[PDB]
Amino acid sequence: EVQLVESGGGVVQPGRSLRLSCAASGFTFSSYGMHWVRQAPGKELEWVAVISYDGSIKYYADSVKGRFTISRDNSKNTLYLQMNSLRAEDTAVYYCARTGEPQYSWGQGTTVTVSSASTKGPSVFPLAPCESTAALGCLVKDYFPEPVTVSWNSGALTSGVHTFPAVLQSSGLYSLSSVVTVPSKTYTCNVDHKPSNTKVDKRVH
Amino acid sequence: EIVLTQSPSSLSASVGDRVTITCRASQGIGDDLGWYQQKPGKAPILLIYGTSTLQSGVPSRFSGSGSGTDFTLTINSLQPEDFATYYCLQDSNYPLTFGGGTRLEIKRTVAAPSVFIFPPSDEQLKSGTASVVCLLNNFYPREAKVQWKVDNALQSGNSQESVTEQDSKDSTYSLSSTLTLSKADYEKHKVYACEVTHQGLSSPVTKSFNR
Ligand code: NA
Numbered sequence: 578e579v580q581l582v583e584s585g586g587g588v589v590q591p592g593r594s595l596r597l598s599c600a601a602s603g604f605t606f607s608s609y610g611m612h613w614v615r616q617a618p619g620k621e622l623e624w625v626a627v628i629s630y631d632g633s634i635k636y637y638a639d640s641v642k643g644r645f646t647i648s649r650d651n652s653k654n655t656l657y658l659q660m661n662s663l664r665a666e667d668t669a670v671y672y673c674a675r676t677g678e679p680q681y682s683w684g685q686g687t688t689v690t691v692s693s694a695s696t697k698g699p700s701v702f703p704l705a706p707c708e709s710t711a712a713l714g715c716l717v718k719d720y721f722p723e724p725v726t727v728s729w730n731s732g733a734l735t736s737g738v739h740t741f742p743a744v745l746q747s748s749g750l751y752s753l754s755s756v757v758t759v760p761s762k763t764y765t766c767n768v769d770h771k772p773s774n775t776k777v778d779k780r781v782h
Numbered sequence: 783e784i785v786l787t788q789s790p791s792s793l794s795a796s797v798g799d800r801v802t803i804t805c806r807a808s809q810g811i812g813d814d815l816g817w818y819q820q821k822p823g824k825a826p827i828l829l830i831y832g833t834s835t836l837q838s839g840v841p842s843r844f845s846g847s848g849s850g851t852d853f854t855l856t857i858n859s860l861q862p863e864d865f866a867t868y869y870c871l872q873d874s875n876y877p878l879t880f881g882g883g884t885r886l887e888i889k890r891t892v893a894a895p896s897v898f899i900f901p902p903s904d905e906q907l908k909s910g911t912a913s914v915v916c917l918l919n920n921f922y923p924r925e926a927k928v929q930w931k932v933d934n935a936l937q938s939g940n941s942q943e944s945v946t947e948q949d950s951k952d953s954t955y956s957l958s959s960t961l962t963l964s965k966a967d968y969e970k971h972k973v974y975a976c977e978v979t980h981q982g983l984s985s986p987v988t989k990s991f992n993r
Contacts, residue, residue: 612878621869622818622826624878638877639783672825679838680816680831681871685824704900704915707991712898712917716906739919739956741944746962753944754958756917758896 579603581673581684588690588722589663597687599656599673607631607651610676613658615669616686618745625671626658640666663691694721694749698775701768704756705781713781714756715766719748720773727755728767784809786870788881794889794923795860803855803884805870810850814874817846817855821866822947829868830855865948887924890953894982895921899975899989902968912968914961916976916989920954927979928959931990933971937961968993 580602589595599611613625626637626647635647646659656673668691673684699720705713717725727740734757743753755766768777785808795801805815816831828837830846833853843858857864865888870881895918902912918926924945930937940963946956959976975990 614878621883622871622880624880627876627878636876676873679828681828683825683827700906700909702903702906702913704903706898706900710896712896712919714900714915714917716903716913716915718906718913739946741946741956741958744942744944744960746942752960754915754960756898756919756956756958758919 579675579679579682581675581682583671583673583684583687586671586687586689588692588694588696590693591664591691592662594659594661595663595689597658597660597671597689599658599684601654601656601673601675604675606649606654610678611647611649611656612674612676612681613645613647613656614672614674614683615667615689616672617666617669620669622672623669627676628656660689663689665691667691690722692722692749696772697721697750698773699725699752699768699770699777701766701777701779703779703781704754709761710758711761712756712758713764714754715768715779715781716752716754717743717768718752719746719750720752720770720775721750722772723751724771725751725753726769727753728769729755729757730763730765731767734764783877784811784872784875784879786815786872786879786881788870788884790884791882792885792887792924794887795865796889797860797862799860799889801855801857801860801886803868803886805853805855805881807851807853807872811872811874813849814872815846815853816871816873817844818869818871818880819866820869826869828871887948888953890922892982893920893922893952893954895919895926895957895978895980897976897978897987897989899991901974901991901993907965907968910965912963912965914963914974914976916959916961916978918957918959918978918980920949920952920956921980921982922954923981924948924955925981926957928957929977929979930959930961931973931975931977932961932963933973934975935971 670686702716740755743751813833900915
């Protein structure tokens with residue numbers, strides 16, 4: 578089966594350089610051209626660059642021309658994207674796509690985040706009010722980078738739970754809330770932030 | 783570049799329905815337009831290319847038509863797995879360009895939101911920041927309006943909203959609005975009110991508290 582596995586994504590400071598790679602398997606890599614396509618948060622796909630099967634012809638999107646370089650190693654079945662002078666606008670999921678002349682076959686992509694933020698664990702605050710159904714939650718504030726996972730009562734509570742997508746705050750840190758409605762018992766949200774090795778249990782009263 | 787205008791940005795349908803999604807090029811692109819399907823956290827999958835040529839394995843309920851500048855995606859008899867986001871794609875020239883996308887959501891009866899307001903925790907106040915959270919729980923359709931009033935003073939530019947994906951059980955959405963103030967600004971006002979406008983409510987509902 579056709580396989581494309583992007584890697585190399587991560588958090589990179591603005592102005593730094595990063596190298597994305599794409600491992601291809603299941604087909605004759607040296608016989609196909611390859612594209613790079615990215616998906617900024619909340620936006621549609623944006624084409625980035627293309628490269629012929631032998632690597633002699635390279636075209637770039639205007640927004641990345643002069644900064645990005647596309648290359649390939651047919652002996653390694655690996656496609657590359659060298660990103661220089663990275664900007665905040667360059668944050669996105671970078672996809673690897675094969676073309677033919679299945680018109681386009683895509684990998685799962687790798688995430689690139691351009692930010693000056695330092696890895697930071699989240700602050701967990703309770704959400705309590707001050708009628709049958711009631712509502713409680715947790716405010717996971719000022720953490721970086723994505724993601725965080727939130728359970729309730731160690732996973733014993735799932736019905737009625739809503740963990741909202743994080744929003745990017747002016748400070749460069751992320752913040753989200755997790756809420757659950759209950760019939761008007763102990764309630765504890767469990768916050769997990771892998772990047773900082775932070776694990777927090779907070780009861781709500 | 784060749785700009786693709788996709789319509790509509792979202793669409794409501796039911797299983798078994800027939801769906802039509804439109805995409806217009808700012809200039810002639812012949813028949814070099816395809817259609818992509820994507821779901822949250824998944825890579826796009828090509829469904830149709832060459833205007834009308836259905837890619838191997840794609841169900842026959844998918845079909846493309848039109849040539850020149852206007853292009854259409856049609857899905858006969860929707861299936862539960864078909865609810866996702868669709869994009870048109872053109873590779874006639876460089877750069878390759880994509881449409882805005884169309885989020886195809888499950889249509890459902892109108893459901894008013896449950897509204898809750900949470901004051902800022904005392905723990906957070908010790909830090910110098912105050913977050914007031916307003917919750918719109920399980921409502922439909924997705925469109926809603928939340929207005930923050932602090933002592934009857936309409937707030938602007940100091941809140942962020944977050945919407946969940948359409949629920950897989952009841953097909954509703956949920957939304958959070960967060961008013962962010964500093965400890966100083968917050969302690970200088972008494973009543974914090976969240977007014978929610980939704981077509982499931984006979985009139986807007988206001989949840990509030992006195993600090
Ligand atoms: Na959020």
